[PDB]
Design a protein around this ligand. Sequence first.
Ligand SMILES: *Cc1c(COP(=O)(O)O)cnc(C)c1O
Ligand SMILES: *Cc1c(COP(=O)(O)O)cnc(C)c1O
Lengths: 273, 271
Amino acid sequence: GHMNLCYIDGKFLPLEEAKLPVTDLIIQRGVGVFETISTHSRRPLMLTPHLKRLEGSATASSIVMPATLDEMARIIREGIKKMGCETMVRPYITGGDSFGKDHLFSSSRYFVIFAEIRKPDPILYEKGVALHPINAERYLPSTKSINYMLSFTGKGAYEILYCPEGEIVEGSHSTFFLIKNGHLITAPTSRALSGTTRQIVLELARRGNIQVEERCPLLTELPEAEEAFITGTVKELLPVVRIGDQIIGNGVPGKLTKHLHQVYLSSIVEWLE
Amino acid sequence: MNLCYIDGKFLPLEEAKLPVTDLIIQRGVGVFETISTHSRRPLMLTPHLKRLEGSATASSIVMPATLDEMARIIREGIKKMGCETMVRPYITGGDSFGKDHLFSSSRYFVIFAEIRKPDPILYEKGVALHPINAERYLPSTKSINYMLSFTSKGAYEILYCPEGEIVEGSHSTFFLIKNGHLITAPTSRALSGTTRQIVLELARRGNIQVEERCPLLTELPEAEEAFITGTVKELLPVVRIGDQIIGNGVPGKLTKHLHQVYLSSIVEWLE
Ligand SMILES: *Cc1c(COP(=O)(O)O)cnc(C)c1O
Ligand SMILES: *Cc1c(COP(=O)(O)O)cnc(C)c1O
């Protein structure tokens, strides 16, 4: 393993030493966007797609990029080289100190945290997890912002599930997939964040001739479901056995979830950079 | 010279920093207040600090300092500024959400800045609001999350209008004047603004009828006047909401009257 690191103001620091000025509007106004990038075999997964989504997030938030993607990639690769071990990398783009008369954040800061990967406990893959449905949605759902406050305030659920007017969109942190009569159902990216894990799962489904519906699954359809799972770079495919007071299928991780997870882990090297 | 109280010291604001581990940075876990001065006395200090605790408590953040200590820090800071001051105390999540479902290592800092009232032209002409079909979740919490507020047509402020029901501004309480009545969203829906509270008490005193309901976007053609409220801006007239002019498109008689009564009455709530 290795010491957790933070790249900030041109230097790799011990994470515990990295500080941001209190003037930054990430602190005062929640103006921040970020990515989570994970390694397999010490290579970043979906590095260019994560970086393209980071720019996407900044641009949609009126934040000018403080560094080019080529620079971010060079910093991310140097940091993973310093860690010497499987790493979770989180680049952060801040608003910086001002919103100009031009309606842009033009003094954005950025920093990159490097940490050891802490996957969810293998028991949660064996037993599956519970989600808490709420009648709320993520606004600007293409933006991966730093605003997770609602995820904390919102029955021992692993994650809240945004279910506006009873349409399942996604988790606070994770893409949601439903399996009904061997089909994969997941919200369209008009409503859900364009997950990189979500994208890989959709391409594995295409390859394995599994039909995909890009529509919001309904809370009212959950009794008719066999399986469910949530996705994100660190968790991969995490089975979901319970949503509110509805058990999913027979209440244990299902056949198609475990299959797609195994295909994911066998296939993952194609998307490493 | 702007100051920031952090780790027991008043620093030049530019020198104050927070660790990047803090979940205010990583996860937007933070609450704050805006406290402003008249004649260098803090207005509604005790109500502001009560609402700060309310926001922290509702967000599962354990207060890192007592309200007596915050009040002491705020009063010393205003005294060091020696001008009319805007004060903003911030309570952060800190580095962890414990297995007890609490933020137990909260940090705090307090920013002191010279007060910047909106330009007197904006009081003379009034401002525009941009309506959005969105709402503030946990609307009684004054969180640091203003992402939506930034990101139309040089509108002063966005107006949360979920399903065409006007709730409030990103930063401000919204009041509509219709048939000489005052219309403002209930605190089931809108943040309990301190300025909002004082204006409702001035309406009671002046026998102006208040309806605590969400005014409808569809009612704005039938409205005479509107205004938004916040400690620094006081009552700021609103003459346009998207493409709808309010009344004759100028600050109205009742808005100006309530602003004058607000400025004459404000002594009673200074601390
Ligand atoms: C980051 C995130 C995800 C997961 O995306 P990955 O790229 O697969 O890691 C899902 N939903 C939300 C809301 C997220 O912010
Ligand atoms: C701070 C704030 C107000 C205004 O509150 P005052 O106590 O009058 O300054 C109104 N709406 C929201 C959303 C706010 O955050």
